[PDB]
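Consortium newsletter contribution from the modelling node. Members have asked for a concrete example of what our holo predictions look like. Here is one, prepared for the PEV complex that several groups have been discussing at recent meetings.
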Amino acid sequence: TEAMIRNKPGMASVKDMPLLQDGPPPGGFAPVRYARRISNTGPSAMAMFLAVSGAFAWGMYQVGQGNKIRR
Amino acid sequence: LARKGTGGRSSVSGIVATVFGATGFLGRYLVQQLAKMGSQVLVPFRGSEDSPRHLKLMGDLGQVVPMKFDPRDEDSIKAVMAKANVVINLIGREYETRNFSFEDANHHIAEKLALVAKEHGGIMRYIQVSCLGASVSSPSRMLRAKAAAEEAVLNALPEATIMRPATMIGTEDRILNPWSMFVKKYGFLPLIGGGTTKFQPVYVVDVAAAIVAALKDDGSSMGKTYELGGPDVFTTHELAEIMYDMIREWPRYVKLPFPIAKAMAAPRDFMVNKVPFPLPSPQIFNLDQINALTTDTLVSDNALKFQDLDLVPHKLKGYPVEFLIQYR
Amino acid sequence: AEFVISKVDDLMNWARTGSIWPMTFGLACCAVEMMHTGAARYDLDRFGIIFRPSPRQSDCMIVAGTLTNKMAPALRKVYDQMPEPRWVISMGSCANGGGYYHYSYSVVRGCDRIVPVDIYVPGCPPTAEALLYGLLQLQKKINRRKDFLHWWN
Amino acid sequence: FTLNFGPQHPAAHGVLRLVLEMNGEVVERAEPHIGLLHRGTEKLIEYKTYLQALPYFDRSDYVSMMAQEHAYSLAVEKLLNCEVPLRAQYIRVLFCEITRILNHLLALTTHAMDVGALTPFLWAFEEREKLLEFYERVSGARMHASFIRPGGVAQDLPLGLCRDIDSFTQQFASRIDELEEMLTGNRIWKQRLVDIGTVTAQQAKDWGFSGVMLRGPGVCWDLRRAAPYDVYDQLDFDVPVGTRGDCYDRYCIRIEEMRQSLRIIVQCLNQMPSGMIKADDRKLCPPSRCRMKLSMESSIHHFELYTEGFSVPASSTYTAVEAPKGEFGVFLVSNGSNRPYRCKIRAPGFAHLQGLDFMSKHHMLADVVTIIGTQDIVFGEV
Amino acid sequence: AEILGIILPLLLGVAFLVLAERKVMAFVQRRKGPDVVGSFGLLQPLADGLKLILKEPISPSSANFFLFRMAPVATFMLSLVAWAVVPFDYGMVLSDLNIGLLYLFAISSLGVYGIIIAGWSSNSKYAFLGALRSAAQMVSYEVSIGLILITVLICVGSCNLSEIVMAQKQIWFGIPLFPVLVMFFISCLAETNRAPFDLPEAEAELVAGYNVEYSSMGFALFFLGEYANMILMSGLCTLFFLGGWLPILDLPIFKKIPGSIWFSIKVLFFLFLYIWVRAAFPRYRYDQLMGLGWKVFLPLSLAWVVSVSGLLVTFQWL
Amino acid sequence: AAAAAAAAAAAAAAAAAAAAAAAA
Amino acid sequence: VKQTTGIVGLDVVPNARAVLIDLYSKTLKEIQAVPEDEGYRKAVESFTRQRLNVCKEEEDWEMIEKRLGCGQVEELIEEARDELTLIGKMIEWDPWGVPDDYECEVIENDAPIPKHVPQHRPGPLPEQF
Amino acid sequence: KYSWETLPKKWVKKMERSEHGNRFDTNTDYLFQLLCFLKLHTYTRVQVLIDICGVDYPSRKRRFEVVYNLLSTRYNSRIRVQTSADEVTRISSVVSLFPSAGWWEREVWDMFGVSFINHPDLRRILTDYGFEGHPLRKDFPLSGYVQVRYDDPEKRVVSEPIEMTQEFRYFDFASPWE
Amino acid sequence: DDEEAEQLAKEISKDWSTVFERSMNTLFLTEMVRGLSLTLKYFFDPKVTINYPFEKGPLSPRFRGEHALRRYPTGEERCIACKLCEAVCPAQAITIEAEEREDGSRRTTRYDIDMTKCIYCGFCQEACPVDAIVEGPNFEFATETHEELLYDKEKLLENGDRWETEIAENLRSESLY
Amino acid sequence: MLEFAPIFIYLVISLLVSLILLGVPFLFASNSSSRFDIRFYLVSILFLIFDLEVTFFFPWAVSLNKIDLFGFWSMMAFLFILTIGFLYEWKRGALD
Ligand SMILES: CCCCCCCCCCCCCCCCCC(=O)O[C@@H](COC(=O)CCCCCCCCCCCCCCC)COP(=O)(O)OCCN
Ligand SMILES: NC(=O)C1=CN([C@@H]2O[C@H](COP(=O)(O)OP(=O)(O)OC[C@H]3O[C@@H](n4cnc5c(N)ncnc54)[C@H](OP(=O)(O)O)[C@@H]3O)[C@@H](O)[C@H]2O)C=CC1
Ligand code: SF4
Ligand code: SF4
Ligand code: SF4
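And here is the predicted structure:
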């Protein structure tokens, strides 16, 4: 058998049997990423302290002015 | 019977029983005996399907088949006793319930199961279970009913064994478990009548071992009303003395004259009156259990005892009462 | 009439069927499948099922995996401390019946030997949906309770 | 002071029954109790053929299924001399490696749920329910895929499985990154894991750790680089090896080993030869349904292979693969008959859970669940 | 009286917070939470309740009824009485105490009793030591909350909570003292247990860590207490630091500016932050936790009292 | 208790592969 | 100059060469107590002499490793000290010599094993550097 | 193989193989001494006791065969030292050399019954607590002797009665002509 | 050594505007706010959940669920009693008794698969020569009682006729393998 | 004080509410369904001390415009003594 299970009309020979099974497409798949691409594009060490310090510098002045208005 | 096995839990014993009172304190030991010696048990339950769940185990894959049935409706009792050769009857109440009265739960049922088993010709052994001292003219209406039940199960169906177990002790019982959880009223135990009652309790395992022993016996134990008394004829006070040995508590009894008790149990006796509400099952103070408590007739006379079953009961100290440790 | 009893049973059953927190005796892989049935795809927190880590407060107990003869006393001791309206689900072949190890000396032939079981999730590695359908069958078993009608006899 | 520390969260570590002899909060000794999951596996396999023996292996380690079938298959090919094709090897690795991912996705985030991080568990379990769409598609059962048979592998991949495994591998670097961004940077994680269960290499060797707990300590020892048992000698991948040994190194490894396993999956996908699925030796591999029905000599073998078995020749070998837990090896003495003879299963978690005694000495009682975390203790193998 | 109008809606708030936590913490995990019981799980809290109520006890044990059957009552009564002074809008506080804040501090100092007693009546050495550890944690992040409130008090004139929320008309104390809000939140997380800081609340060690006689009522009351204590300690991060009932003051045409709705929005933000921060962070182990309340949130709280006192004394902003 | 405390300091994260990156 | 052995626990030894010379001289001196016509003494003598020689010739630990291709000098010290333990152990319960009966059945099964099966491949030769 | 030249000839007493993993079937007396060799030796450095596989040959005279596997992480090789000890022969324990041998030898004694000499804490690890009998022997029936466990009137307790189950169906697949 | 290791691992980060970077990360949680941000991104993203009873998880034609004894299109149970599945069964779930029926062609008087004592490995589907026993994709057959879970002799496994419309489909699509 | 009466009745009405929440489960569901850890004394004494010093913070907090720059420095001296105590406790190692 095995030439009556995989017919492929013609083929003249036991080789050239159909042989259609699963696999990667011709040319493989896309290059798959595996590294750790963690983007560190956030606020830096400064700009976070200076936003906090800047908020403290101006916002506490605003607390003071609000205390003046309340008084 | 047609036994093909070695021990149980997969053997056969030709006993396809229908333990009518299986979903009950006596029932769980009797069903375990009948289905650990390898025999089918057609446990019929009355209401919530959670009642016989604790019996789907202790029997191997259909050795225990819980079935639904209405107590007052026949053609369902006949369906429960369709494929059966043994029919034990544990259906009994110590308290009147608004729907089922003392006779409609102790006598008018046992007579009904007796008749519908007689009709279903093939019930080889029909055991009828009633309390000891359940003879007519007993004060407690529960015992008069349970006496009429014996008289009607023997008449309507002769050669029907009748066990007479006295108050049965064991886990989840109605005799010791109410006293504890009332010792949880700060050691206050209200032994009624002053403990002059003389009653012979018995480890429920041994009552079950007797109920099965009258099945495994020969043609004898048919129509012979046993009295499953037990050892060590006690008194209520003395039995309470043994509880306090298991549950670590200091004996702090009180005596209650019978008028005081019957007045304390005068409520919960309007069961037929308070229709739109069921009462919470009087545990310790039961006017009928008190009427039984009065006369110490709960002692085994010269009638058949455990000795006529090649059986000797366990004591009431040690393991056969070690269910009280869960109260320490 | 009886209609009020029918509706109070419908209400009690809706409660006990909506919030049914099981003590998941997750022994073995059927606990990994049970974890998939608790995971993101088949939510069990959707159906109210909250996997309790303690037997003390739990409506159910989804015993899964091979109940070993040594984990039989522990399973029984855990089942004895669940509040009375409890149910047990057997999940996987090893937990419901003898299973791949029916003839193993150390394996009990199904938890039906230790705890009384109410719904046997079938399939040795039940699909996570299959355990979920077993729980949706336990919900039916609740919806058929009518405990109030039986308390009124 | 003895404390019966049991399963903190059931359904995660099932039958964990330690008996900790503590000192206040500092643990002085941890005595694990085994046998609560001791099914008769090392006895039941002596009673069944070499084919019936295979399903026990997916049930040995329940979070990394096919790795043990692959360790058994390689122990009934070590005896049979049963040369399997190239496609069988590539599929067998593409699923042993998908299983490494299925295990680290569980043994990281179940560990991370014992530590306290609740969300990585559910993200990783969505990932695992994507990989069980491959297990369940290639064999049938989502968990116990009795698929890696002795000769080759049970049956070929469906005609759409490599495309789906690719569409998964493309999106799996991001899932590892999320599992990493949520746990690696956290100061509540490092604090819960750094210098926890540190195992000097001499200890990891002594106690036969041989897993991700032998590459924490820094012993470069992977049985895919040491004893390449498949296309592994062709596939390129770097074995991450720790430098301190603390439970924070073993986590970082298991989260890199989950990327190198992604490399191996992508390679096995990109180079999977269209060859036969099972060994051509039809006296070790049951012939296909089509052939046994049409060919009388194939029908005889399908009958004597699904009833009698192989009858692998008399020998005794210890075939050990790198299962995710560790060096899972199945010492398979084989009497000449068709049934094995003392198919002893060396399972890591029997050697790792030994390490709990010395790993969790002087660690606080709340660390004893972190140790059990990083050991990947699955009690099926113990 | 009108105490019903602050306890019943708070009971509903806690019952629906169990669902809000399950549902938000589930949405975080890419999964819908309780979703079958009600239209959107909205009846799921009632289902949990009506289940816990209909669960038969494991043992009646009504004998020991004065020891630990009123200790959950005490914890819950404290968690509910600390709601009097909390103002929801201008003139909506039930009882404007001119020392309101110190009264909240005292209510916490009595919640310590609640925990200790309800843990001692549980005759379980492991559970009692767990309750003692939880009390020591709740009381060690109380010196830090104390000093944080001393900061927000220096900024304000008086302890009157209606004044502390009226002293923010110009700017919420969340903007200048943001580092303090982060410390009050990370303390309110740790004062209550529900947090990255809940090793005594590690899933298993919590249930076996408060009592032995559950009967369901104890389990619900502790969780109802924890969730009210959480609604409260989130209704403090929104009085002190966020503007108690103040808008951003842009005065929109679309927005008619209801007060209690703004207080509600902000306490919802902080409850959602409780949930989010329970989902995304590992537990602290109670041995790094107590070493974070003393070595991290006490120095960084003391510094803040000296910083917000200095910067307000030099420039006369007081 | 003199038990060795878990010092949460260590060396910085540097992914350490094996020497077989390029040519075994 | 060596920063650290990648292995945990095997602490880097600065005086690697000196303690190696010490250990190999101790080993050569202690091995004399076993009979000469025993494979164990020929082996110990030969490899201890080779490593002691290469340790005396070269100076840096790196050159010791490079020529004596046996991993790292810390692991080499572990090996030498373990060898000293073994020689001091072998002196006791002396197993040297062969009793008259000496039945030792060498068994050889030559079945080829399939290539795709765990086979412990040799690994890199000391041209790793 | 280098290991056989240096090893004292008496230690590899009975047998020696040369494929499917090499083994030194030694004698029980020279075992821990043989395990002392192959470890703490410069050219043979195993250090790693992978496994201790009890194997029961009922037809032998020395029934069991305690198969010590051994990996050599240094030289990348694996040696399987074996022994032979019947039911009542205490065999030397190698927990002192490889501390992983503790649990493996507890399992070998539990399954088989090959007690181990000077093994601290030699206690049944796998089988049940009150387990009598040694399972992984050959003469131990699969279903066990008394190993059914069911609940009963002895509440909260699972008894251990004699066993009864659907009979394990042993199939005689083995064909003639081998 | 740990003392010197600490001294050096803290003298690695010892240059101003690096001590400041690390201080800021500890002072204002940076790694932790990256945890909260990711968690939020997942709080708002669509949910990978499945309201089960109405839609169910994806399966495959090779899926092994409830065992079903197939039939030949023209009635006649496909199960000739060879007992190959009773032999191949790892858990020995299938108990087969055979009797020459009156027609003369062998058939199984008793074909009882014990589902509880069954591992669902699909060995029976492979071993059966005529595809008589196959696993239907049912997998939803949780039974209230254990006795029902023991699938009777050729009567409940004969309910595969209902599942034949799906079993025939799965076989027509899997037979290529 | 006048505003203390609402919380005075609050305690009692919340007592009633909790008693009802207690009695609700009790009514339904009828018949048918370490020697010493001294660190807990150190943590306790230390909370006592730090809550005493917060008690001293409170009046200084609410009255800091009155005490212009002298009450502030006196409180900072009190706080430097607090800090010396707290540093002696940190170094000695009571915070563990
Ligand atoms: C960028 C904005 C950040 C906002 C963050 C919001 C988060 C809120 C919700 C809760 C988040 C998670 C809670 C985690 C609890 C643990 C936090 C913690 O204690 O972290 C470290 C401490 O973190 C904190 O205490 C954070 C509190 C910040 C308060 C302000 C810090 C300094 C402010 C400087 C102000 C500058 C201007 C002032 C003068 C002009 C502890 O140190 P470690 O052990 O992690 O590592 C170092 C060990 N030595
Ligand atoms: N308990 C004792 O101490 C003593 C009892 N006995 C007798 O032993 C027998 C069994 O005792 P025990 O099990 O403790 O008794 P229970 O009162 O607990 O009832 C046992 C069984 O009787 C059934 N039953 C009772 N009344 C009815 C009814 N009206 N309709 C239907 N079923 C009913 C119960 O059904 P359900 O559970 O659904 O209500 C249950 O199955 C009874 O005859 C009893 O009187 C003998 C000596 C004293
Ligand atoms: S029944 Fe099957 S899937 Fe379930 S635990 Fe047992 S082996 Fe695992
Ligand atoms: S899948 Fe088939 S062969 Fe395997 S155990 Fe189940 S019934 Fe038996
Ligand atoms: S199901 Fe298949 S193997 Fe079983 S008897 Fe029928 S044809 Fe034979």
